[PDB]
């Protein structure tokens, strides 16, 4: 049975003049494991993963700026803003070497940080991560018109900002099993007001699909190139049919990435942590000793 509670004491740290919230559990020494969520989630997404890792390793799960329990400064909320705040968060906590556990826009942040700090990354576990998607044909058909509308002037803001489409529509449609009302209310809480929803609209407008936007496309290409030459231990979780990482892409990564273990989790769309947390958490726990 998949837990709905969030039994983690809040921790806060001042970052660039704002407060950021994070989970921090597990032993106080050793290599920390840094869990990075994406859109439109928070550290809540990791709530059933972390308890598998916390017996043996420090677990740190921040809420990205403007998300979860973190502050909501007056930012553009472009990808580079998230880069700046996560960079400063990692330094504020004095992290030296880390293991990354990353998902969605948290994976773009994590891989981009790893490329810039390769000596500090001891391993990377990832799932449903940001890759350059070559055509809209590789996007799931049932969500293609919706994500094209998110990236259409005016219409996308009406859907995401005014109608909260990313929380009420996309989030439950990208989990195979049904989310409960308690889980939905945890995901809803940081975005109850439209004025808080800018990050939810910025993120799909930065997805690198069919070459655009060019700046994100090049950045993601750069860290994918880094990943392909890196000897760092890697662990990929994938499901079927997937969203960002269809089975054919999981197969391509299994062939091309060095030092990669792959784990098929069964049915899965995008929020794989909500479909098979016990397999994801237990397999990360089993993989960490080999690092």
Numbering used by the authors: 3 to 293
Describing publication, verbatim:
We obtained crystals that belonged to the space group P1211 and diffracted at 1.6 Å resolution. The final model contains two enzyme molecules per asymmetric unit and has good values for deviation from the ideal (root mean-square deviation on the Cα atoms of 0.3 Å; Fig. S1†), with R-factor and R-free values of 0.16 and 0.18 respectively. The overall topology of the secondary structure elements is very similar to that of the wild-type DhaA. However, specific backbone re-arrangements are observed, which encompass the L9, L10 and L14 loops and the α4 and α9 helices. Additionally, we unambiguously identified in the electron density map the presence of bis-tris propane (B3P), glycerol (GOL) and isothiocyanate (SCN) molecules, which were bound to the DhaA115 enzyme. The bis-tris propane and glycerol molecules are bound on the protein surface, the former being also involved in crystal-packing contacts. There are three SCN-binding sites per enzyme molecule; two of them are also located on the enzyme surface while the last one is deeply buried in the active site cavity. Analysis of the enzyme access tunnels and the active site cavity in DhaA115 revealed that the volumes of both the main and the slot access tunnels are greatly reduced, and that the enzyme active site is occluded. While partial closure of the main access tunnel was previously observed in several engineered DhaA variants, the simultaneous closure of both the main and the slot tunnels is a unique feature seen for the first time in DhaA115. This double-lock is enabled by: (i) the triplet of residues (L148, I172 and F176), coupled with the re-positioning of the α4 helix, that lock the main access tunnel and (ii) the structural re-arrangement of the L9 loop coupled with the re-positioning of the α9 helix, which lock the slot access tunnel.
Haloalkane dehalogenases (HLDs; EC 3.8.1.5) are α/β-hydrolases that catalyze the hydrolytic cleavage of the carbon–halogen bond in diverse halogenated aliphatic hydrocarbons via SN2 nucleophilic substitution. Structurally, HLDs consist of a canonical α/β-hydrolase fold, which is composed of a central eight-stranded β-sheet domain surrounded by several α-helices (i.e. αβα sandwich architecture). In all HLDs, the active site is positioned in a hydrophobic pocket buried between the α/β-fold core and the cap domain, and this catalytic center is connected with the bulk solvent via a main tunnel and a slot tunnel. After several iteration cycles, we obtained an 11-point DhaA mutant, hereafter referred to as DhaA115, with outstanding thermostability (Tm = 73.5 °C) and thermophilicity, as demonstrated by a substantial shift in the optimal catalytic temperature (Topt = 65 °C).
